[PDB]
Design a protein around this ligand. Sequence first.
Ligand SMILES: CC(C)=CCC/C(C)=C/CC/C(C)=C/[C@@H]1[C@@H](COP(=O)(O)OP(=O)(O)O)[C@]1(C)CC/C=C(\C)CCC=C(C)C
Ligand SMILES: [Mg+2]
Ligand SMILES: [Mg+2]
Length: 332
Amino acid sequence: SLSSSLKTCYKYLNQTSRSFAAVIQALDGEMRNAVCIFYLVLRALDTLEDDMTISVEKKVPLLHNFHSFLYQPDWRFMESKEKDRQVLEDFPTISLEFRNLAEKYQTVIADICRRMGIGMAEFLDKHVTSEQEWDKYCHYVAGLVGIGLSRLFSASEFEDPLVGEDTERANSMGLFLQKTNIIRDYLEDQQGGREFWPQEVWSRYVKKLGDFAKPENIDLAVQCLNELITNALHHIPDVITYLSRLRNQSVFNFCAIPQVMAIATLAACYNNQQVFKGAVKIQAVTLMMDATNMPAVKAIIYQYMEEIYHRIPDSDPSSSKTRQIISTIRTQ
Ligand SMILES: CC(C)=CCC/C(C)=C/CC/C(C)=C/[C@@H]1[C@@H](COP(=O)(O)OP(=O)(O)O)[C@]1(C)CC/C=C(\C)CCC=C(C)C
Ligand SMILES: [Mg+2]
Ligand SMILES: [Mg+2]
């Protein structure tokens, strides 16, 4: 049945994706290969972005031109020192399967890969400063993913045109996952020399972002944490809107399950000193089972919002804001 190279792609998906492998492979019809290949192309792109052994001067053209390599049958990259580097070394297998997809899917994937490459390259010579720049960075690495997935759903015709048209809601869906991961991964990122928390926020608490790892700064660290979580909560209305429009069951699950995992993650991290001591974990199997329709997804969201709500310290500088956003979400 499945070709040799396509079988390899699914192996690469299963090897490199904890959050998405299962939901991708459960997608109906043409969406399955289209989303699997989209995933692997972006995974390869990210593996170059993240590799600190590649100079900025070498990295910029690679990220800028990456979308064109999809059309060059023996393009590969042998100099990665990153863990996921099979997708780069065996890129010809991935690009072959890309060129086997229908044109309408090719167009979306290449457009997103082009735009993300430009965006990633832009942020090689700066850190994230303002909250606005934080949205911008998150747009480039995650918002564009949501926009691309939405365009693939509409192109497949399992979903209505509106899904791919409403780039604001698609963008928000991606932003919610990416802000959640960035918040949760403070320490692991710190330990690999990576900084993604917005400097206009953290610099109101400490002089260097790394200072949140020091035990004496825990109180300030948690305050900043709660500010950032409060920011991320503002994406939940759009997530609800986006999910409420989906018709196909496999698409709904693919979209909803990672969103509810992110909500559960934020709730676990809220006011939690452990974020600064290791990776905070969530329920996964349960949520995978329950998050298969809108009324159940809404109920899951409201349950986690009430968990956060009744944990808000009155003294937290963001407490008013956290209460307000939770109220809005509860009222949609
Ligand atoms: C094409 C597909 C599913 C994903 C492509 C993922 C890739 C490789 C992107 C290259 C840049 C990166 C890395 C972005 C970060 C992804 C987490 O990876 P990871 O940390 O490895 O997870 P785990 O370790 O838990 O497995 C991220 C947070 C963005 C997720 C945003 C989505 C999915 C939009 C949802 C929106 C709608 C559905 C409207
Ligand atoms: Mg990465
Ligand atoms: Mg990266």
